[PDB]
Assembly symmetry: D3
Homo-oligomer: 157 residues x 6
């Protein structure tokens, strides 16, 4: 009964996120994707849309499920009966801040954090940058699941 | 008559800050903790509370005093008759930005900046992260002075 | 017919920027400085003032011209009939984010990004830090073109 | 079913290494410690003493075994029926390198690498630094397991 | 009129090196690949094979030539009638060093250095890692040009 | 009463080292330059010439003395009646390492390490790079004190 949580805001989910989902799914018996929305920061997609996009991109992963989190990621992790977090690393990641959170999460709840480097082809995509480029007419279709592409296309007119 | 200034917003002061205060105090004849509040950014604690918390955490350091700064840190430093700043380094610190400020401060006023690594046990605490975790019910009591813990507890109800 | 674009918000232009302009100008047949203003973020100087300051600082560079960009930097680059961007590196630069943008820009439009380290004397100046120090009465005159200094002086009273 | 390999030269094993072994053992069904032989550049302890030191230091982890490797780490991993490497991060880790190896290992054999931050109290110990300090008379006994301390003090008397 | 030098030991040349050659050849009138001889620390291939490998791998770039250098890279650059060095950035690059050399080269001869990020698919290959993996039986043929692969498989049979 | 140790191999001392000596001498009552002997890996200048070079380059600092050390830097520091090390940061510094040593030195003897950024004009010089360039005929005389320049030009004629 091994398990890991993949936390994030996923606004929207990218192929960078999916690559990490797939690696977590391959190495742990169970994997929970936790969508932790910021109560102060409203992004582009609403919670239901973010859930849909994640679920639409992870139908091929039987041991993975999507779930909404509130408050501490470690509280969510423990409520799943798990003690592990898996985080992706890419080009631009604030790794020092990821390390700070990792140590903090370990300190407050005994939760381990495992970092894994995203595949090179998906190493420069992030949610905020994909949105920025897309909303200015740039083609990021290869850097996002097709369901996400369909929805970004809907917001052109 | 050697002296160093430890500048910051201290909202709230952490055991990371105190560790740096103690090391500065051990190496310099006089040490001034400068609380430089951001006029645009309002945090959690008001200036009086921030002063109180710093003073409540530094009663054991005879050659240290707490003082409020306005404008340039270098203007505050020079007004204390000093030419040195001591800054802490921890897990997550934007060190490139600390370096930029250090060079700038040296350029504009001839003020030296000394960096020192915080003790490992207090290396992942920061004011903003401690607040975030605490306000979601997380236990950061070991990562803050007891007086600070008492005040964070008061803001639960 | 070689060419490079030097993009930025230049609010205001610094001697760090100029140093990069000069190096780009020395190595490419044509060089276009693209002023890409953020539609969400309003800074200190208006677009006309930013253009003036850049033009006032680059009269000595015959193969360089100043032009306003809208939307994607790569769209601006391609519209100049170019395939290259030149970016400066200094003390504090978020290099991981510069790398992310570089890879992204290459992916979406085949545009190459060339990075060059600014001269050490101008390695700690940035637009935001120069403004912060100046508006608190600090002397950054050596870290900015004289025309920029004149304008920063006008906003004291 | 799940498994991870913890590779290294372990000359000698530190409490930093053991911390990582413990994290891996808690999150995977099986952990294999792979002791890989370095080039002409040989070390203080021979292979048998290295094996024994790791073994005596990990008696509290029943799902962990120790094994020598002679070629590619990925070949070792695959021959064990696994597809994951777990590696520790400490102060002084060459991350740039670790990431290069991770990407290379993923490319040549499809093996994933997971990185974990070592506990702060054990974040500054490394085999080479421990050896250097110990040989010069310094006390690193709190940073190494007792089986290592025993063999270390026998070498210096 | 415009020109760039791409310096290195190229032992052997990788598809990471070639990617950079291609970027330079597209943006400058002339590119010179400078093969500089390392100290006593010699390598796998001799100078003539190194030259031939670079030559056979760059037949698709008519504005590129290959030349041996024996002293300072800046002396090579200047003797070629140029003032620019182009260097690739990959996962595992010692940037801290590259920047030091860039500043030193600028100081001693006024030579500019331009950095370019290698294509993601070729971002984890380096000469030394490719050699290590190949000698241990791993397949790095997708990361090296065929002229290098040919000479590499002849050395291991 | 206050004191700092500036440790190194100083082979040879650079104007980067001297900048740091000057910062330390201005902020502490006493500064001791500790010349520590490296392992089998010996250098260009012998110990006596190294001592003399540091001495002749620091005549303008009356509160600074020079002394050889043979073991742990912390043992040197403590035997001098001090508890502080001052170390310079330059372009190309291995910070990751410096921090590891700082934490280790604090752990084994309670000695604090203070880091200071070298002046920009002297931020790219290091002993090894200066030696490399000088031996190849390059002019590094502006980056080294004249006592070093004298002994350097006598070695190359
Ligand atoms: C959910 C959580 C893991 C963040 O997930 P996320 O939003 O998907 O994280 P991302 O991958 O998008 O990147 C982090 C974002 O924070 C920002 N960030 C980066 N460095 C930062 C730093 N030093 N300080 C604050 N924010 C930072 C970045 O802008 C980044 O967004 P962007 O790069 O896309 O513009 C985190 O907020 C969390 O755990 N929330 C629950 C509350 C909690 O437990 N907090 C305590 C953590 S110890
Ligand atoms: C007081 C001063 C030293 C900052 O102190 P501080 O607020 O305690 O600094 P902190 O330790 O909290 O960390 C810096 C904060 O700035 C932010 N920061 C980090 N990198 C940054 C960067 N690249 N650019 C802008 N802000 C940055 C961070 O969010 C961090 O807060 P957080 O990590 O807790 O979320 C500085 O603002 C100052 O000197 N103010 C006086 C005005 C002045 O002299 N300015 C000129 C400086 S050259
Ligand atoms: C114009 C452009 C190159 C930015 O230029 P710029 O504003 O002059 O950049 P700067 O040199 O001032 O520095 C970048 C700023 O972004 C911020 N920044 C730094 N790291 C960041 C990160 N990780 N994520 C988001 N913003 C970041 C910094 O605050 C910095 O400002 P500051 O350091 O002065 O406070 C970029 O916004 C752009 O290309 N815009 C056009 C739209 C586009 O093409 N976007 C797609 C890029 S792939
Ligand atoms: C065994 C292996 C994981 C290394 O483990 P290790 O020796 O315990 O690793 P450590 O972190 O203790 O030490 C790494 C050492 O290499 C050095 N290292 C760091 N950066 C390096 C670089 N750029 N190039 C080469 N070595 C580097 C460090 O100096 C460090 O030694 P130190 O303790 O003296 O600092 C690895 O060498 C390996 O996989 N070997 C098997 C062969 C193989 O698979 N090769 C191809 C891998 S893609
Ligand atoms: C030729 C030259 C550009 C180097 O090229 P190169 O060998 O292809 O460079 P690479 O990136 O492949 O390798 C750099 C190597 O040096 C090492 N390097 C990295 N950091 C270093 C450091 N701090 N100090 C010394 N070498 C370092 C790396 O370990 C790397 O080797 P690797 O592949 O085993 O990792 C350079 O040495 C040069 O200019 N030589 C001519 C002489 C000269 O001009 N000297 C003064 C320069 S300011
Ligand atoms: C003397 C001492 C401070 C080093 O000083 P130094 O030689 O002048 O330091 P420098 O910055 O000039 O050089 C550091 C060198 O080590 C190397 N260094 C950097 N990273 C390293 C690493 N990961 N592992 C080992 N050495 C490293 C660098 O390559 C650099 O050499 P360079 O100029 O060729 O780049 C240190 O070795 C010391 O304290 N010695 C005394 C013994 C002791 O106390 N040991 C335990 C310390 S915790």
């Amino acid at each position: 009964m091994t398990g890991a949580v993949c936390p994030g805001s996923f606004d929207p989910v990218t192929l960078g996120h999916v690559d990490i989902f797939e690696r977590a799914a391959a190495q742990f018996d169970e994997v929970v994707v936790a969508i932790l929305v910021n109560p102060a920061k409203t992004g582009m997609f609403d919670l239901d849309e973010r859930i849909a996009m994640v679920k639409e991109s992870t139908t091929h992963l039987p041991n993975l499920r999507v779930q909404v989190g509130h408050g501490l990621v470690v509280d969510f992790v423990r409520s799943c009966g798990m003690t592990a977090i898996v985080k992706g690393l890419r080009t631009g990641t604030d790794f020092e801040y990821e390390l700070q959170m990792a140590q903090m999460n370990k300190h407050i709840a005994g939760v381990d954090t495992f970092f894994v480097a995203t595949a090179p082809r998906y190493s420069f995509v992030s949610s905020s940058l994909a949105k920025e480029v897309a909303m200015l007419g740039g083609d990021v279709s290869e850097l996002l699941p097709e369901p996400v592409n369909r929805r970004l296309r809907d917001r052109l007119n």
